[PDB]
Amino acid sequence: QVQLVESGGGVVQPGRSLRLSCAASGFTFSTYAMHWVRQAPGKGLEWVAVLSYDGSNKYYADSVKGRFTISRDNSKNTLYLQMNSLRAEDTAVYYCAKGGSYAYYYYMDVWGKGTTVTVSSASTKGPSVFPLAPGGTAALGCLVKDYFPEPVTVSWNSGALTSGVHTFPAVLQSSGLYSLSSVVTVPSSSLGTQTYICNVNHKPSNTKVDKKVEPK
């Protein structure tokens, strides 16, 4: 059970700097080599950097050369990635990865859960939650608008209503904030004797909204 716990991920404005950290456990971190991999939204996997067992040899990718720096502290069993002058292209989910035995930088045996870095000039905001109010079957939903950063989690009736629920991925509006909608189809007969509430949870701003969707 090799454990890789990322941290240091959050919001950062363009031109600023950020420092990620990976806390390895369940193997002699000092002997193995360490990786950094990212994946931008809607894009494929991209290898960032690698380091040897002692920290002496580092290799990067042209997309990050001279702008990122990888280091390690074998006493603290932690791996670092100093990200200087971050652009919007750097907005991604960054993973750390265990490499090969010593200088064998050709393996990526184990991946961390990954932390997310958001390069934007916006500020952390909670979401506005508006009702999508309601054929043989009807549709209703919740508009979760103007929050930052990702992600939000939507449930219906505190988890009781699951059948027919479709929570759409978020779109990034031109203002820099995200918008999202979660809908559920229900039989028309139960509209007047069954209440529906969407449970929007936005951890980055510590927002919890339960919105009641009613007919008009």
Binding site: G44, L45, W47, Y106
Partner: peptide, 14 residues
């Protein structure tokens, strides 16, 4: 995805 590890940089498929 396919990913090679013959050399650095490690590269993935489309």
């Amino acid at each position: 995805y396919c990913q090679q590890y013959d050399n650095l940089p490690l590269t993935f498929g489309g």
